[PDB]
Design a protein around this nucleic acid. Sequence first.
RNA 1: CGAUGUCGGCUCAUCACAUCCUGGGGCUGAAGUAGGUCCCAAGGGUAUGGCUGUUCGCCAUUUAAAGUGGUACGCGAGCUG
RNA 2: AGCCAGGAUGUUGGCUUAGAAGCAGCCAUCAUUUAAAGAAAGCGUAAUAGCUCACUGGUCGAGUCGGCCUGCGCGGAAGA
Lengths: 134, 94, 135, 136, 38, 176
Amino acid sequence: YVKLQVAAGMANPSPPVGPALGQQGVNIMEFCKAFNAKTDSIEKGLPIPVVITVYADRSFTFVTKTPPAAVLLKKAAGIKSGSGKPNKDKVGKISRAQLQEIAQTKAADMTGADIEAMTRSIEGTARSMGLVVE
Amino acid sequence: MFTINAEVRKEQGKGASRRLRAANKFPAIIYGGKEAPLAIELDHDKVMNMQAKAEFYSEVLTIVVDGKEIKVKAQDVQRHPYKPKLQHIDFVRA
Amino acid sequence: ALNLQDKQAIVAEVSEVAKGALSAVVADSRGVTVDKMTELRKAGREAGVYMRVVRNTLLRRAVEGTPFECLKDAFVGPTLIAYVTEHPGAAARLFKEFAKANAKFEVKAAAFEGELIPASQIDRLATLPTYEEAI
Amino acid sequence: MLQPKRTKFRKMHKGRNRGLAQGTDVSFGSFGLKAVGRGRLTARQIEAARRAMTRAVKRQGKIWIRVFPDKPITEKPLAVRMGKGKGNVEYWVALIQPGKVLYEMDGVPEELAREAFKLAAAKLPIKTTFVTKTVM
Amino acid sequence: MKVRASVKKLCRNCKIVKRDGVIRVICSAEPKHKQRQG
Amino acid sequence: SRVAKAPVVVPAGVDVKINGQVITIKGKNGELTRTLNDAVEVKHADNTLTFGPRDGYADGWAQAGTARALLNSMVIGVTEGFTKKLQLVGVGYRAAVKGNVINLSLGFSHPVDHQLPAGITAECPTQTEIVLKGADKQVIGQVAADLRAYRRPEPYKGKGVRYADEVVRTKEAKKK
RNA sequence: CGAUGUCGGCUCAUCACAUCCUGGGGCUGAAGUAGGUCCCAAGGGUAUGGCUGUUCGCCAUUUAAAGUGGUACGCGAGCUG
RNA sequence: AGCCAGGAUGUUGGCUUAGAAGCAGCCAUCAUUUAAAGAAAGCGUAAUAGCUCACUGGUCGAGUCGGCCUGCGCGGAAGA
Ligand SMILES: [Mg+2]
Ligand SMILES: [Mg+2]
Ligand SMILES: [Mg+2]
Ligand SMILES: [Mg+2]
Ligand SMILES: [Mg+2]
Ligand SMILES: [Mg+2]
Ligand SMILES: [Mg+2]
Ligand SMILES: [Mg+2]
Ligand SMILES: [Mg+2]
Ligand SMILES: [Mg+2]
Ligand SMILES: [Mg+2]
Ligand SMILES: [Zn+2]
């Protein structure tokens, strides 16, 4: 049982997913094509998280999760890489309308009850990466 | 309201004052107004725990000298050179 | 540490919800991870059910104010309360499926009508449907 | 390392260190390190202590040194007989009577001041106590 | 074993003990932390 | 004090005899006898045992506490009985019982033969398992320590005689 | 100061332990072998040579080791000079 | 004090790096479900895992904690 973050339409190279999951006992060709067949609806250039559930007979079952909070704040502000020193250096800006956009997508994984509860959980991910709310 | 209990001193001077402290007590003076100054002795452990609160040095305190009640205000305190103790207190009639 | 000002406030917050709610469910929740609990918290808020873990000593104080003054004997061991403020039932069914599917705990006692319900007869508030069923 | 810039005279008579300290109260900061012992604090000792407490507070807040080593100390070297004049000045001390507030500090929480003062006390030849600023 | 005049607790698993009038620092988590006053 | 105040409930089938400071506890598992410190005053009454300090004796309660504790594990001793389990870790390490003697093969030039004292009985469910049984907690504890002393667990592989519940913290050898 | 012979060697020693070896043990940045450090321990043991008046030191080659000190810097009514 | 139970979610926080996923470093240190859970006090992994603490619910059932002024002791303490 391992947790990984593979691209929307990319799953096969050796340095990121190769011997990380293959060391346990997972088929490198069976998962690499079943994952991209279900993540075809997900937009290009968006890292999507996936959790693997392996049994004693080397068999596997995966459930796809919504893109990360520190991932969606980069495309919304227009940045490739975050700040080296957060709250000391400002790299971008995101409005109150963009905060609720990241929160409505993350609703499947978030613990919050109301929209305001899920919005504040993205507000903290933005402050901790240098991005200022404007 | 801080209530201090005191007795008038039967003696004065070095020898007599050193004796008070050795007996876990300390001398103190009450002066101010038309009245003559009053030399009193105070219990050390009681007055120490009181002066620990900052309100002691600001508020009006009442001194009980043989039944009588005197309203005062702490004017000047003499402390021990290095121990957490009191050597003498100047009280002023209010 | 819980000051008495905090303790009285926890007594007050649960004494208020007690008056308003219709069906209250009392159970054990020892040996269950937060993953399964945050899940039973989502299924509760959805069904109009209030979910809390309160000191058994502090429960005997917020229940004394009537009509749950028969849940006293249910305040021995880990206690979890399910106060249903919106539509009677909800929890009494939500707990029965969570108990069987997770195997941990047993569910102490149920309360409705200001009357005591034993651990064996919780099938009474579990068979009740909607409000919203009489039409 | 503290030392007087100029002096009226070079060498001082030995003297004595009787009596109690003048300057017993925390007069500039919020906390203090008070002398319980009687002795001499050298210019090096003062610096050693000052450095320890500064390193501790991460050079936050403010420190005061209420003592100044204005006393010159002479010494005769090896294979030198008695007399033939007073020895040469080698180091400087500050005469310390019980009660002297040696160091003062503020701009730090009580817990840190205590720790800082604990570290500096280890570099001192005389016993010390922690003292707080008092109303009168 | 460390034999010194100043025997102190070094971690939370350090315990001070008096065995035959000798102050000892007996520790469960770190054997390096074992001290005897002397 | 907190220990001494708590009484030892002597069950059915357990006989208690007290001759001043000497206590004899007879049960189904055996008979044990202990001489209590003069500072301890023990009272019988009902199906219980109560302990307390004797007048004039300074360390009264500390002594009374110890007494209770000893007599409790004595009461347990003559009924239920104590059990210490030891497991042998390492290549060629084997053990077997031939009556009151435990034969131990522990990587030495000579096999180690450990004689068992009165009341202690051992058995080997495996070639790498020694199970001790008796009534005296202090004696079963002692025998276990003596067997463990022949080859204490090494910190580089955990090799040696270890208690069944013993946690053996291992470590890596010096780098280069 | 109406005399208490000075360095080193030779011979002969005796004590201390702040232990060089041998013995017991704790920690190790102790796999093993072999070390490092500290604790306990004074029972015995603890090189011959080259150079130099040397003690010492440097060097050669040994040994389990070639300890540190006190004894009028032990020892000339014992020797040497 | 002991013992039972939990110690979660966003999230593998961002930057950096072959990797840094509480746990090489550097900077920030909020927010959510909450009984409570540090964007983590230590051990562990190539990085993950895994173990435990801070904190909190249960059990127990009456005391418990550590500063101050002080008396008398203890270690610190080896020699011919
Ligand atoms: Mg006089
Ligand atoms: Mg011993
Ligand atoms: Mg003569
Ligand atoms: Mg020695
Ligand atoms: Mg050393
Ligand atoms: Mg010898
Ligand atoms: Mg020749
Ligand atoms: Mg050699
Ligand atoms: Mg001589
Ligand atoms: Mg001659
Ligand atoms: Mg507790
Ligand atoms: Zn420790």
